[PDB]
């Protein structure tokens, strides 16, 4: 595929690289979980508060 239809793979994986592309979507998706007061942040804060 890389030898033959490279451009198609480029478009599918990253597209424009701003909102289209699987990796581009993953960027925002994972950043959502990693953001401050994210899901993990809330879980950790709740455990900390409970320990009090």
């Amino acid at each position: 595929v890389l030898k033959d239809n490279t451009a198609a793979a480029r478009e599918l994986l990253v597209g424009d690289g701003k909102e289209t592309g699987i990796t581009t979507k993953i960027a925002t998706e994972v950043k959502s979980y990693l953001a401050d007061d994210g899901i993990i942040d809330n879980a950790q804060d709740n455990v900390n508060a409970t320990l009090k």
Partner: peptide
């Protein structure tokens, strides 16, 4: 040029 190259044919 882009619309030609993208096809990768």
């Amino acid at each position: 040029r882009d619309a030609i190259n993208d096809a990768d044919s």
